[PDB]
């Protein structure tokens, strides 16, 4: 079509996707709060530091509506499951992973319908850092399922730290 | 007692996580306006205050989780978009001034149900959202009273917070 | 003046009476919960005790129409859903303590107005609710000092209260 | 969908369940009364009867519970106070056929929502009303068509329901 | 048609009986690895509910044959083998609550095909169903919220289902 | 080595459950015919022989969990439908025949890798197999020898084979 309406339907997946991230920050932040609470440190940080990485491709899809000349969307996309037992966790996120990894890619493609190469990149950019997302999960979720307590057992007690506090105003 | 206690505590504390939530979203979607704009020091101070915003949120929620509760993942009220910039600072002023309004009878009900270290944390962050409340009215004062001259200088300023976000990748 | 003597009774006996009334409703609706939760004997003694009331509430009614009166139908205050097991024994020790209180000077007024069948009533029926405010006491400790040790011995349990109502059909 | 069909049944549950919590008070407030008219058949198996309400309430409340429901605590209508013997048997009639009606149209729902289970617990609930029916209106009968010659028969005798409620105390 | 109304319920028991023959499996892989664990309350209860399934199979058989049909030998699905406590009392839920959607949905051919027998049937063993499906929400609630104390104390009981197999040698 | 040994009698051990579980199709089918006609000794002692079957599938599932193993699901062969009476009694016969023979084979295996208790868990099966293969070769013979003149006073037999196998509901 024509230049708007290719801006258009970029945009219109670019809010699908963040939708999707917003969603994946509360999940993932939720999950967090609750292996903070248990004390799985390891796990707690890294979970954190996943969630993070979602912050991060929600404001670069976000960047990216915005020099297409759309407004960045607010609301998440499905809604946060609460108090998932630590072999759901992995398993469930793993699953999440899998199905964002599917969707955005199927959206890279209409990027490249739109001859939107810059928003085509992105996408690309980003899948390849939750199919790391995705691996980390599997592999957690293997070991609780192969290893059982024997594994977290290493990880009560380990630092939950991701680092110096986060740079902001005050 | 104890048990009701808790639960009244925990109340606050949700209510006051859904409006941290709300003001992430509020204070970002302004960013990506600012930033769009090339305002770059607006830009970068309106993303560095939403990660104020997010720590408090952080904060709620793990006093939450020691008082046995589940932290909210619903912001409060709704988000407003394409604010203008002399709107942006006249209504994150009010936001600031409403939020240290509700938080302080947040903490009185900490008081009232003797949990001092949820009290402590209220009392801490109202003096953060002080911080904010002095940033807002400052630069709309400064919009109000001086125009272009001072955003003249405040275009095609910096606006990076610094180094990136120490993530999983 | 007899009448008012009566009345005045009367009176009292029906406040007790729609206090019995809500303690009914109140417990068997920690009653559904429990069982829903499957901890059986807590779910079986929970109701014991709503019957209890039952009885109380009928024992109420019985004075007071031999007094001449009406029983009253509504019941004191509203009933609180959704309580979680910690908050359903705290809250049934409060009531059990504030019902005692109560009962202990609507008695005051049966002495007062010279009716000493009606006092003797309160009487007995306030050593009962000491029965059922230190066993709701009871609970509430061991959920507090052991927790889900505890609750882990429960779970599973019978919660039969006995053979089943016996009714018309 | 299916949080859909449960919500839709455990209103139909709830409404029904406050039509049994108002039978419930309606006739014990009866039950009261004939007892100090010294009718203890009559005020007997008014007792019972009510128990049988007391039974149908519980259960729908366990049904809502399995839903994922809340039970309600509030009656249905309101209770009406010293009826005379022939209003009694009346408007139990009355009421106990507009039960059958309503708990019909409820059963037609749980079916309309795929809910067996719920559908067969509103049919076994229906039969046993029946039997309330056709009791009151038999006694209303012998109230109408021989008055004080029926009733000089049920004067003074037993008004037991038999060994009293298993209790806590 | 006499013939086509037989075929059609004759589909639908079979397919319900493959379901039971599944289940059967299914139950009896779990009890023999609880068993193997030496958690007998657990073993022996889910070998109980293994007998019903295989009753359930029984009577669809019996009605298929009164039908004039014949009853399938193949189970639907395969068995899934090693699965860990949480994951037996997870599955055996989501798999009664299928069990009874997909009962009731044979329920209805069953009337639709106007066979009040086999419908009936089908009614009363969706009872049984949700006996079941109470029951593994229950371990899953437990196993969920007391972990291991709950499981300590299932440890080491007894494993006896009863008298043994009432058999020919 | 010890692992090995244990891997060839769980090999063996799922031949025969397999073989267990073809059985308890296989006959279960039949006594589902012989009812289906109204033999009812002949279908009672069919299904008491399937329980006997049922057995032996679980001491065999049993001993695999004590050597490690996971006890199979799958049935050996298929299931024969609609066999006439005379072929009911000749086929099982020769059924039973050859899990004898199968069997003897399998205790070989035992007695090889040095399994004594599964070994002597063979020898106690093959002896109730062998109770099969007459009670089945016995059948036959009256069924040549004297037809229609024995089914004739098996016709209306009564088929119970006992109260109800006591299951969870
Ligand atoms: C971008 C963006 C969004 C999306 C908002 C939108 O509406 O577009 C975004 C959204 C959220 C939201 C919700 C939450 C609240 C989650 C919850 O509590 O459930 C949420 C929570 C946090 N973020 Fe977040 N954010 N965010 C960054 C960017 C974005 N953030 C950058 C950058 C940093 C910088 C990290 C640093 O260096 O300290 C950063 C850090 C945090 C920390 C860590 C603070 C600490 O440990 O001190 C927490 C907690
Ligand atoms: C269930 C249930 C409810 C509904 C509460 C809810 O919110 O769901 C429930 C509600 C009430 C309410 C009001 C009253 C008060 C009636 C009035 O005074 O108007 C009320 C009254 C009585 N109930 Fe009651 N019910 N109910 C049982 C179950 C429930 N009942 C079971 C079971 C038994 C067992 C029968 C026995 O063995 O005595 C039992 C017995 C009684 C007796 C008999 C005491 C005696 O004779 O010693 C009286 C009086
Ligand atoms: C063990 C075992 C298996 C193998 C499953 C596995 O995968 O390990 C086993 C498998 C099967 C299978 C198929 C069927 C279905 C037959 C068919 O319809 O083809 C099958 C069918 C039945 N079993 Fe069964 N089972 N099972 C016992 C043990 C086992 N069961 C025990 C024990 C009892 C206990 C009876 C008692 O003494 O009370 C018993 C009884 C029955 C009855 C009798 C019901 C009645 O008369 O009420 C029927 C029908
Ligand atoms: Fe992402
Ligand atoms: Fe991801
Ligand atoms: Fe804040
Ligand atoms: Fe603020
Ligand atoms: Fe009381
Ligand atoms: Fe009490
Ligand atoms: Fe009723
Ligand atoms: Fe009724
Ligand atoms: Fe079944
Ligand atoms: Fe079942
Ligand atoms: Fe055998
Ligand atoms: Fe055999």
Same mark, same amino acid.
């Given at each position: ?57 929600? &404001? !670069?899809?976000?960047?990216? +509506? #915005?020099? $297409? *000349? ?7 996309? %499905? ?58 999960? &599997? !592999?957690?979720?293997?070991? +609780? #399922?192969? $290893? *059982? ?7 009560? %007690? ?13």
């Amino acid at each position: 079509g024509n230049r708007e309406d290719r801006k258009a339907k970029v945009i219109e997946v670019l809010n699908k996707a963040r939708a999707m991230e917003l969603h994946a920050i509360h999940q993932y932040m939720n999950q967090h709060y609750s292996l903070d609470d248990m004390d799985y440190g390891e796990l707690a940080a890294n979970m954190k530091l996943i969630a993070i990485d979602e912050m991060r491709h929600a &404001e !670069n899809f976000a960047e990216r +509506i #915005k020099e $297409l *000349g759309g407004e960045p969307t607010t609301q998440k996309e %499905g809604k946060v499951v609460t108090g998932q037992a630590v072999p759901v966790i992995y398993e469930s996120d793993a699953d999440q992973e899998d199905a964002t990894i599917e969707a955005y890619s199927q959206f890279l493609k209409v990027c490249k319908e739109q001859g939107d190469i810059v928003t085509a990149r992105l996408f690309e950019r980003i899948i390849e850092e939750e199919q790391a997302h995705l691996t980390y999960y &599997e !592999n957690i979720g293997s070991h +609780i #399922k192969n $290893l *059982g307590d024997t594994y977290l057992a290493k990880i009560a %007690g380990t630092p939950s730290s991701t680092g110096t506090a986060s740079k902001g105003f005050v």
